[PDB]
Amino acid sequence: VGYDDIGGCRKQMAQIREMVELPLRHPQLFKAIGIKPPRGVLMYGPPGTGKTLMARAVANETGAFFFLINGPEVMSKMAGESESNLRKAFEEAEKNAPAIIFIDEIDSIAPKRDKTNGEVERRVVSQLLTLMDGMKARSNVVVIAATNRPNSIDPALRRFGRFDREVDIGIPDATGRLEVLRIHTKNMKLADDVDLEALAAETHGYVGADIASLCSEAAMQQIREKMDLIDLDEDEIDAEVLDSLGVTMDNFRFALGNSNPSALRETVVESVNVTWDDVGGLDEIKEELKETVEYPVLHPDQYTKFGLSPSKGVLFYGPPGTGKTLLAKAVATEVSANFISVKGPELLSMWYGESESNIRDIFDKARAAAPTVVFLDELDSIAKARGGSLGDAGGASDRVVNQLLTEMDGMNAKKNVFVIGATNRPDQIDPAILRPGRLDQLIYVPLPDENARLSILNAQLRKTPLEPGLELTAIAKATQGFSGAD
Amino acid sequence: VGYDDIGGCRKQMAQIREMVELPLRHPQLFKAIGIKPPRGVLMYGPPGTGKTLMARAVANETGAFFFLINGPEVMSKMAGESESNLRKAFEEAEKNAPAIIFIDEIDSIAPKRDKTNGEVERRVVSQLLTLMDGMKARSNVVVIAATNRPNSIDPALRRFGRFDREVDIGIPDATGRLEVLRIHTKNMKLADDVDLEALAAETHGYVGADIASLCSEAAMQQIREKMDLIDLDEDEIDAEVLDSLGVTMDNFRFALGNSNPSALRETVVESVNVTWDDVGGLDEIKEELKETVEYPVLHPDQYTKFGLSPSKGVLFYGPPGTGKTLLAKAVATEVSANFISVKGPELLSMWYGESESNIRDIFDKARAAAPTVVFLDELDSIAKARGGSLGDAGGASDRVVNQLLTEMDGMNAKKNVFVIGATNRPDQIDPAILRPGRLDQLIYVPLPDENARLSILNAQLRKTPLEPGLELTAIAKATQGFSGADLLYIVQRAAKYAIKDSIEAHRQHEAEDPVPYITKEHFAEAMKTAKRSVSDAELRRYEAYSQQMKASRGQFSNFNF
Amino acid sequence: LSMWYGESESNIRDIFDKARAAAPTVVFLDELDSIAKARGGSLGDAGGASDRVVNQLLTEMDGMNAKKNVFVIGATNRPDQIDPAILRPGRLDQLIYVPLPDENARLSILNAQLRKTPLEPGLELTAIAKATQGFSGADLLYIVQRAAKYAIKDSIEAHRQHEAEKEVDPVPYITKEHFAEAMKTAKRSVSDAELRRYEAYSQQM
Amino acid sequence: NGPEVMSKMAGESESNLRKAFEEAEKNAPAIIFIDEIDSIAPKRDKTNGEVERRVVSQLLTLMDGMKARSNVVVIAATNRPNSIDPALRRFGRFDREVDIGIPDATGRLEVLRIHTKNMKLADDVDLEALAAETHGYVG
Amino acid sequence: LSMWYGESESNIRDIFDKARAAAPTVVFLDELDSIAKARGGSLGDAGGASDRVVNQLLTEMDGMNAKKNVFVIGATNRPDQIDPAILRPGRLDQLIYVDENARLSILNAQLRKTPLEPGLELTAIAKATQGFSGAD
Amino acid sequence: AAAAAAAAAAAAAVAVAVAVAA
Amino acid sequence: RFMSFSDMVRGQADD
Amino acid sequence: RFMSFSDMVRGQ
Ligand SMILES: [Mg+2]
Ligand SMILES: [Mg+2]
Ligand SMILES: [Mg+2]
Ligand SMILES: [Mg+2]
């Protein structure tokens, strides 16, 4: 494993390479400019991004001495032994040569000394603090650390001298995903019909540990497909099958359609099967939704050359049983973006401040795996006019709607997150939610007319045997006031 | 490492110099006065300020014996061995010569004997107490201790005879940061363009090591500035580049733009890119905000000349979609002071007391790295009228608002902390929060006028190509009731139609740069679905609230003096 | 207050132990509406920590004999939210009411806030007091700070003009027009409803 | 088993997991089975016990770290998947989450035929009707 | 009614349980009007709490038989705001209506452990104060 | 010779709940 | 040159 | 070829 296996983060790679290599390859520059280089790095980011992989690559590539310390590995039952273990580790690292010390999962041995209540924890943290930057000082020892949550670390450790700089190994983009796909499909024998650009395009929120999962699932699909047909031959596997094995594009399509980003595994939606042909009528609405959800994704170049950010939100209102939820299902089914579905009051909790925590967690998972369509069914439940309750319910619903307001348009990075709202009582919505930039478009889904009713009838009877002589026009004419549900 | 490598703490430097040298340089003089000198000192302050550096300086300069004790190092596994280690340390220091003990991170071996539940710890604290005072306690040896959490120390240790004097090595001033910069840039090659005075002026919360990091970063930039023109040179780097490197002022500016004080690492906001030209309209509000934030931080001599403190708080209020959060972002990006963006319901917690604890930590961070601006978005979420709910969670909201009241105005040090509030329902804000002294300036952000909507449209189209012949005066003249968000919506619809036309033209060309800018028809067809956001009910509600504030304007005249 | 069990009452006990140790002492409880909050009603699965804290404070304030004199100063904004147990005679007796200043009080406020302030010699502050007829001390402080800010702005403008014409102190005191302009943005801090409820509380007791 | 790794001393639960994994990887290709894993994966964010955090971190390091595993397979079983640390539900730690849910009529018929294979029945007994009448019975 | 957790028939209920446990006892109910207040009809949260408190008092006072030798003592200044449902016969029927000599005796008992001047008479204060009270 | 041992198990926290009054 | 904490602990435990 | 956690704990 070398540095050419960590594709997706070139900037972070070079940022690590600077202090990992330059002070050892060309020490003349630093003595010429006078000041010493940084000797402290903290790699942070969401799980499955390449932190441990980068540490492994550094260990394999650099000629310096390497010392691996797992997080909960130093602590022992004996009183006064954890700190002894840390002392011995650093002494061994420093006694031999200019070394590199990698501390994996460091958030478990640095609980701030103030929120923790134990006694060995304080002593271990203080030992680390004094030993990385105390009298005596390190000598040619550079320390690397990796964690999934940096905020749960002692502030005294996030200072120059101890952890000089924090590298952010974050979620890749289309180019990064393509690089990861090339890296992970360099040792397998692919078919001639597979392209990797489309796979990197349709793959949206994948953190790079999911690309390997996709590749492995495709390979397993090929294996089972070609093993279930040809005989098992338990005594011995014939070689005429191995030399012609291949991996087709259809396998990758199957694996892609049967997987989701690891960050959204908790909020995976049940596989519903609706299509644009299942929803009759609403042709203009279908076009509007298709454009509003596809143009920002497929053609970012146009938006960036025009120097304007796309419109995101949209609300549906109308009488019940007209197709709002049906449109939501069709979008969730055959649109090329991740989907997050929440019921109306589903995010409420009895605890104090927990509802806002839920709404913030969901909007953070939405912003991480962008582009993402967040469907808020029955907004009037979760977002109602503030200060309308004469008898207060603890002052919670107001806080919930305030958290929504700040989460849909506040101090954010302006990522591609579209909010679909659906309600049948628009009058009970907070007017600050209907502002453009939060829910720009307000689409009325009216009752079908004669042609719309005929199209709805044809759509509902797509898969149904009928008489050759049956005419549905009379049914459409007879109603004149029905809805799709009727 | 001598005494000239420490800057910004001259007073503390002298305080420790006297105690360490005079009783160990001219002991006879202390026989003349009659009494014995103090022989114990506790240094405390935020991390990265120079406590360990000062201990190292004392060790290097003073010619007496020096003994070093790291905090956890004393502890051992064998029964009754920690106390043996402490006794051996003190005896070794005492027997040979007059000596200085140094206990680094003393908070680790002084858990107060009241919150701790261990056994070895509670005997090691008592052993330290006995060693520091008692029968045959100490004869001509001085003890220095360093800590970051002086309140986590056993009070018995903070008594005369054991630790008589507490030195506070805290955050430095502008002159202190200038001294630190001069100290850290004395052994490197700088270009003539470098100006350290302005660089220290623009630094607002950096303490000690922070400044050092900046220098390193600047140098690092130079290393990656003059190595793209030259190859890697695996065999050897040529000597024509080793000389004449130089650290330009642009490198320092770049390194300063990509760093923050170590105290605000947890509260780092995503780097939003807005500017004052990005905010259309509100010219007088922009100027008022700029002056009321920049005068205390840039012109403090006049305030002390008049001998009055400045105004601190401000509250924007108005209809949704008028530019409150946009103004906050503009302040975050343009103003030099540190920015702590805190949302409304972020600080609430399910547990008991963590709401107020979170607020106290946020305001402690704000007061540490002053001058700072704290943005409270939707202030009515956490600061609601007190005692309005008959059924509550144990009165947690009322305790939160009381914590806010006491923290923003109480028994504090009156540092430069500017609170900005933004709420579109200012009627629900508890009256105590709106008193002068907490949020004294209530700024109403109304809907734009005819001349302001044109300014907003130009602000939103400042980076967009347009046709040469159109005029944004008609669009402004034809809204007459819109807000900033509505004009943004019009622009977005026009852009969407332009993109649609471009895609269609591309598809037609593939079947067999058509659209380089937005056409007039693209505005004509994009404003057919344009509606006002705020209705007349909310508009008259905000006008009534404004008139309630102006109701204090009655029965006034020219009041000619 | 603390999340853990015991910590809260332990902290009140430590605070009052410190108060007793350095006797005489003056323990200032600011904003009592957070500690001595009313308990009458029902239980909202809070846990009873507020009740325990109030009981600890009540038991720890009544156990002060003549020795170890400890005088506790209370200060609350909303007087209707304070639990009546505190108000019972023998535990916290004296009730001082701080009313809004009158014209003479307002003049005293203005002179007390402008001690270290160079001012125009031909300046009278009686007018400001006569004008503000429902203001509070904070409002007067705001007026004076606004005047100071206008003075600083004028000083900086004069300095900039002097520097520009270059290629000793133009304004040495807050002038007349500065105070005249400062009150253009002088609002009233307390409305009539709060004064009404405070008067009702005062007259009731 | 889930709760049986927890220990009295500080730094012994992690030692127990280390010993278990070392024994599993010490000799041969091995299968490990953590029954009721949700009892030792409290999500590391909603929990205040420091031992819980340390054991979760140790499990993460054992499952996927530098020199992660050498031809060893791990299986877990839980009733509350959503109450698991998201860092554990990643490829390389727990990549394939199999859903062993309620059977249908055919599955219930199979279960009935399996369970009634060793007991002796009467001549006038059928399992198709008995399987069809049952609706919600799982396993 | 300040114990919370349905103090209505929780605090009063446990008070009556402790009273019946230590039989005989005297229950000095201070400010009976403030507790009862003639609940009647209010249609609110405070009205509901007052009704619950009144119901708890009625169900923990009317259930005292000849056993346990209970005795409830109440006191009030304004009897108009007392609940007529509690002043009915069979539950609480007694009505004790409550001078210069009493004022003089109160003044002499209050100045017992006080170094008063020998040349001072308290009869003038007793005669001057007529509608006063021990608190005054 | 004898030996000592350290142990830090857990503690007890307090939560806060919200109610809905009719 | 590479080493892990467990390796070092076991080595020191050997002696 | 089978082991359980408590078995190993008892053994050692
Ligand atoms: Mg890792
Ligand atoms: Mg629906
Ligand atoms: Mg230090
Ligand atoms: Mg806003």
PDB file of C-alpha atoms in Angstrom, chain B residues 9-170:
ATOM      1  CA  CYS B   9       4.048  38.983  30.893  1.00  0.00           C
ATOM      2  CA  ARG B  10       6.585  41.420  32.333  1.00  0.00           C
ATOM      3  CA  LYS B  11       4.661  41.859  35.594  1.00  0.00           C
ATOM      4  CA  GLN B  12       4.410  38.125  36.253  1.00  0.00           C
ATOM      5  CA  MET B  13       8.005  37.754  35.110  1.00  0.00           C
ATOM      6  CA  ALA B  14       9.140  40.181  37.806  1.00  0.00           C
ATOM      7  CA  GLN B  15       6.856  38.577  40.388  1.00  0.00           C
ATOM      8  CA  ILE B  16       8.533  35.216  39.867  1.00  0.00           C
ATOM      9  CA  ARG B  17      12.013  36.674  39.358  1.00  0.00           C
ATOM     10  CA  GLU B  18      12.081  38.311  42.775  1.00  0.00           C
ATOM     11  CA  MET B  19      10.893  35.224  44.650  1.00  0.00           C
ATOM     12  CA  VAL B  20      13.263  32.905  42.803  1.00  0.00           C
ATOM     13  CA  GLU B  21      16.430  35.050  42.754  1.00  0.00           C
ATOM     14  CA  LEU B  22      16.443  37.467  45.692  1.00  0.00           C
ATOM     15  CA  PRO B  23      16.069  34.723  48.354  1.00  0.00           C
ATOM     16  CA  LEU B  24      18.726  32.753  46.427  1.00  0.00           C
ATOM     17  CA  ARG B  25      20.972  35.654  45.360  1.00  0.00           C
ATOM     18  CA  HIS B  26      20.975  38.038  48.351  1.00  0.00           C
ATOM     19  CA  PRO B  27      19.742  35.975  51.316  1.00  0.00           C
ATOM     20  CA  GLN B  28      21.515  38.323  53.722  1.00  0.00           C
ATOM     21  CA  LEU B  29      19.123  41.139  52.842  1.00  0.00           C
ATOM     22  CA  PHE B  30      16.230  38.944  53.962  1.00  0.00           C
ATOM     23  CA  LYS B  31      17.966  38.510  57.304  1.00  0.00           C
ATOM     24  CA  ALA B  32      18.008  42.307  57.547  1.00  0.00           C
ATOM     25  CA  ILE B  33      14.266  42.796  57.082  1.00  0.00           C
ATOM     26  CA  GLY B  34      13.665  40.174  59.762  1.00  0.00           C
ATOM     27  CA  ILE B  35      11.093  37.829  58.252  1.00  0.00           C
ATOM     28  CA  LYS B  36      11.403  34.918  55.829  1.00  0.00           C
ATOM     29  CA  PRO B  37      10.301  35.159  52.191  1.00  0.00           C
ATOM     30  CA  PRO B  38       7.534  33.183  50.488  1.00  0.00           C
ATOM     31  CA  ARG B  39       8.659  29.780  49.229  1.00  0.00           C
ATOM     32  CA  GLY B  40       5.745  28.578  47.121  1.00  0.00           C
ATOM     33  CA  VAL B  41       4.085  29.819  43.930  1.00  0.00           C
ATOM     34  CA  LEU B  42       1.221  28.637  41.730  1.00  0.00           C
ATOM     35  CA  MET B  43       1.100  29.691  38.079  1.00  0.00           C
ATOM     36  CA  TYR B  44      -2.313  29.450  36.453  1.00  0.00           C
ATOM     37  CA  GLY B  45      -3.947  30.514  33.217  1.00  0.00           C
ATOM     38  CA  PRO B  46      -5.359  29.299  29.909  1.00  0.00           C
ATOM     39  CA  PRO B  47      -3.281  26.750  27.996  1.00  0.00           C
ATOM     40  CA  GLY B  48      -0.586  27.929  25.639  1.00  0.00           C
ATOM     41  CA  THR B  49       0.380  31.089  27.513  1.00  0.00           C
ATOM     42  CA  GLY B  50       3.924  30.453  28.751  1.00  0.00           C
ATOM     43  CA  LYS B  51       3.716  28.679  32.097  1.00  0.00           C
ATOM     44  CA  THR B  52       6.007  25.808  31.147  1.00  0.00           C
ATOM     45  CA  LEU B  53       8.110  28.220  29.104  1.00  0.00           C
ATOM     46  CA  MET B  54       8.641  30.377  32.184  1.00  0.00           C
ATOM     47  CA  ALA B  55       9.536  27.323  34.252  1.00  0.00           C
ATOM     48  CA  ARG B  56      12.092  26.354  31.606  1.00  0.00           C
ATOM     49  CA  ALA B  57      13.511  29.879  31.602  1.00  0.00           C
ATOM     50  CA  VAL B  58      13.902  29.844  35.384  1.00  0.00           C
ATOM     51  CA  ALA B  59      15.565  26.434  35.222  1.00  0.00           C
ATOM     52  CA  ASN B  60      18.011  27.550  32.537  1.00  0.00           C
ATOM     53  CA  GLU B  61      18.918  30.950  33.981  1.00  0.00           C
ATOM     54  CA  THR B  62      18.997  30.421  37.744  1.00  0.00           C
ATOM     55  CA  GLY B  63      22.149  28.648  38.865  1.00  0.00           C
ATOM     56  CA  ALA B  64      20.518  26.697  41.682  1.00  0.00           C
ATOM     57  CA  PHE B  65      19.505  23.052  41.616  1.00  0.00           C
ATOM     58  CA  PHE B  66      16.316  22.288  39.697  1.00  0.00           C
ATOM     59  CA  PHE B  67      14.033  19.292  40.234  1.00  0.00           C
ATOM     60  CA  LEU B  68      11.274  18.393  37.776  1.00  0.00           C
ATOM     61  CA  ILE B  69       8.105  16.476  38.662  1.00  0.00           C
ATOM     62  CA  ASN B  70       5.501  15.689  36.045  1.00  0.00           C
ATOM     63  CA  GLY B  71       2.081  15.220  37.561  1.00  0.00           C
ATOM     64  CA  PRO B  72       1.193  11.562  36.992  1.00  0.00           C
ATOM     65  CA  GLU B  73       4.854  10.512  37.162  1.00  0.00           C
ATOM     66  CA  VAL B  74       4.790  10.162  40.956  1.00  0.00           C
ATOM     67  CA  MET B  75       2.146   7.429  40.960  1.00  0.00           C
ATOM     68  CA  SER B  76       3.243   3.794  41.083  1.00  0.00           C
ATOM     69  CA  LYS B  77       1.791   0.314  41.505  1.00  0.00           C
ATOM     70  CA  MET B  78       3.450  -0.982  44.682  1.00  0.00           C
ATOM     71  CA  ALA B  79       1.549  -0.203  47.868  1.00  0.00           C
ATOM     72  CA  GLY B  80       2.608   3.015  49.562  1.00  0.00           C
ATOM     73  CA  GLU B  81       5.087   3.822  46.793  1.00  0.00           C
ATOM     74  CA  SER B  82       3.801   7.205  45.607  1.00  0.00           C
ATOM     75  CA  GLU B  83       4.492   8.785  48.988  1.00  0.00           C
ATOM     76  CA  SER B  84       7.926   7.174  48.945  1.00  0.00           C
ATOM     77  CA  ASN B  85       8.571   8.842  45.588  1.00  0.00           C
ATOM     78  CA  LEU B  86       7.506  12.250  46.902  1.00  0.00           C
ATOM     79  CA  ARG B  87       9.658  11.867  50.010  1.00  0.00           C
ATOM     80  CA  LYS B  88      12.650  10.830  47.914  1.00  0.00           C
ATOM     81  CA  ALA B  89      12.153  13.800  45.598  1.00  0.00           C
ATOM     82  CA  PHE B  90      11.955  16.335  48.417  1.00  0.00           C
ATOM     83  CA  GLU B  91      14.903  14.816  50.290  1.00  0.00           C
ATOM     84  CA  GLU B  92      17.082  14.716  47.174  1.00  0.00           C
ATOM     85  CA  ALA B  93      16.256  18.343  46.425  1.00  0.00           C
ATOM     86  CA  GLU B  94      16.851  19.487  49.996  1.00  0.00           C
ATOM     87  CA  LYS B  95      20.041  17.620  50.859  1.00  0.00           C
ATOM     88  CA  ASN B  96      22.376  18.839  48.135  1.00  0.00           C
ATOM     89  CA  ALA B  97      21.720  22.559  47.760  1.00  0.00           C
ATOM     90  CA  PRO B  98      19.028  25.260  47.709  1.00  0.00           C
ATOM     91  CA  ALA B  99      16.722  24.123  44.960  1.00  0.00           C
ATOM     92  CA  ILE B 100      13.581  24.744  42.945  1.00  0.00           C
ATOM     93  CA  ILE B 101      10.924  22.056  42.717  1.00  0.00           C
ATOM     94  CA  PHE B 102       8.671  22.291  39.667  1.00  0.00           C
ATOM     95  CA  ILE B 103       5.342  20.449  39.607  1.00  0.00           C
ATOM     96  CA  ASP B 104       3.883  20.522  36.103  1.00  0.00           C
ATOM     97  CA  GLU B 105       0.136  19.919  35.837  1.00  0.00           C
ATOM     98  CA  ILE B 106      -0.390  19.785  39.586  1.00  0.00           C
ATOM     99  CA  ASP B 107      -4.139  19.424  39.020  1.00  0.00           C
ATOM    100  CA  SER B 108      -3.555  15.742  38.247  1.00  0.00           C
ATOM    101  CA  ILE B 109      -2.211  14.965  41.737  1.00  0.00           C
ATOM    102  CA  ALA B 110      -4.509  17.219  43.799  1.00  0.00           C
ATOM    103  CA  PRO B 111      -8.109  16.048  43.333  1.00  0.00           C
ATOM    104  CA  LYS B 112      -9.336  18.057  46.390  1.00  0.00           C
ATOM    105  CA  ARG B 113      -9.882  14.965  48.632  1.00  0.00           C
ATOM    106  CA  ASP B 114     -13.610  15.738  48.643  1.00  0.00           C
ATOM    107  CA  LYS B 115     -14.861  14.831  45.172  1.00  0.00           C
ATOM    108  CA  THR B 116     -12.347  12.014  44.746  1.00  0.00           C
ATOM    109  CA  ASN B 117     -13.252   8.474  45.774  1.00  0.00           C
ATOM    110  CA  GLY B 118      -9.894   6.729  45.437  1.00  0.00           C
ATOM    111  CA  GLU B 119      -7.469   5.749  48.160  1.00  0.00           C
ATOM    112  CA  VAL B 120      -3.906   6.195  46.889  1.00  0.00           C
ATOM    113  CA  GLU B 121      -4.812   9.679  45.661  1.00  0.00           C
ATOM    114  CA  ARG B 122      -6.154  10.775  49.037  1.00  0.00           C
ATOM    115  CA  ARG B 123      -2.936   9.687  50.735  1.00  0.00           C
ATOM    116  CA  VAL B 124      -0.667  11.296  48.149  1.00  0.00           C
ATOM    117  CA  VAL B 125      -2.457  14.620  48.604  1.00  0.00           C
ATOM    118  CA  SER B 126      -1.983  14.353  52.367  1.00  0.00           C
ATOM    119  CA  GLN B 127       1.670  13.436  51.873  1.00  0.00           C
ATOM    120  CA  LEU B 128       2.139  16.567  49.778  1.00  0.00           C
ATOM    121  CA  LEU B 129       0.449  18.604  52.514  1.00  0.00           C
ATOM    122  CA  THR B 130       2.779  17.145  55.136  1.00  0.00           C
ATOM    123  CA  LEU B 131       5.876  17.722  53.009  1.00  0.00           C
ATOM    124  CA  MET B 132       4.996  21.346  52.299  1.00  0.00           C
ATOM    125  CA  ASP B 133       4.405  22.220  55.969  1.00  0.00           C
ATOM    126  CA  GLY B 134       4.948  20.436  59.257  1.00  0.00           C
ATOM    127  CA  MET B 135       7.780  19.429  61.545  1.00  0.00           C
ATOM    128  CA  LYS B 136      10.975  19.996  59.547  1.00  0.00           C
ATOM    129  CA  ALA B 137       9.001  21.080  56.496  1.00  0.00           C
ATOM    130  CA  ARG B 138      11.349  22.984  54.192  1.00  0.00           C
ATOM    131  CA  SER B 139      14.730  24.694  54.575  1.00  0.00           C
ATOM    132  CA  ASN B 140      15.717  27.089  51.772  1.00  0.00           C
ATOM    133  CA  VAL B 141      13.953  25.440  48.830  1.00  0.00           C
ATOM    134  CA  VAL B 142      11.195  26.937  46.696  1.00  0.00           C
ATOM    135  CA  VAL B 143       8.302  25.169  44.973  1.00  0.00           C
ATOM    136  CA  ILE B 144       6.721  26.266  41.688  1.00  0.00           C
ATOM    137  CA  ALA B 145       3.541  24.635  40.417  1.00  0.00           C
ATOM    138  CA  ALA B 146       1.786  25.044  37.076  1.00  0.00           C
ATOM    139  CA  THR B 147      -1.881  24.412  36.358  1.00  0.00           C
ATOM    140  CA  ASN B 148      -4.687  25.101  33.901  1.00  0.00           C
ATOM    141  CA  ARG B 149      -7.521  24.424  36.388  1.00  0.00           C
ATOM    142  CA  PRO B 150      -6.721  26.206  39.663  1.00  0.00           C
ATOM    143  CA  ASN B 151     -10.243  25.529  40.948  1.00  0.00           C
ATOM    144  CA  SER B 152      -9.663  21.751  40.814  1.00  0.00           C
ATOM    145  CA  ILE B 153      -6.998  22.045  43.535  1.00  0.00           C
ATOM    146  CA  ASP B 154      -7.390  21.088  47.168  1.00  0.00           C
ATOM    147  CA  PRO B 155      -7.967  24.295  49.179  1.00  0.00           C
ATOM    148  CA  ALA B 156      -5.492  23.093  51.799  1.00  0.00           C
ATOM    149  CA  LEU B 157      -2.773  23.422  49.156  1.00  0.00           C
ATOM    150  CA  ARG B 158      -3.707  27.088  48.576  1.00  0.00           C
ATOM    151  CA  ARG B 159      -2.736  28.234  52.080  1.00  0.00           C
ATOM    152  CA  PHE B 160       0.145  30.405  53.212  1.00  0.00           C
ATOM    153  CA  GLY B 161       3.234  28.304  53.839  1.00  0.00           C
ATOM    154  CA  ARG B 162       2.353  25.869  51.043  1.00  0.00           C
ATOM    155  CA  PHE B 163       1.363  28.063  48.065  1.00  0.00           C
ATOM    156  CA  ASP B 164       1.344  31.674  49.194  1.00  0.00           C
ATOM    157  CA  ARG B 165       1.247  33.502  45.854  1.00  0.00           C
ATOM    158  CA  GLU B 166      -0.819  32.765  42.753  1.00  0.00           C
ATOM    159  CA  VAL B 167       0.530  34.233  39.520  1.00  0.00           C
ATOM    160  CA  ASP B 168      -2.008  34.633  36.711  1.00  0.00           C
ATOM    161  CA  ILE B 169      -0.324  34.229  33.321  1.00  0.00           C
ATOM    162  CA  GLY B 170      -3.324  35.099  31.168  1.00  0.00           C
TER     163      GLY B 170
END
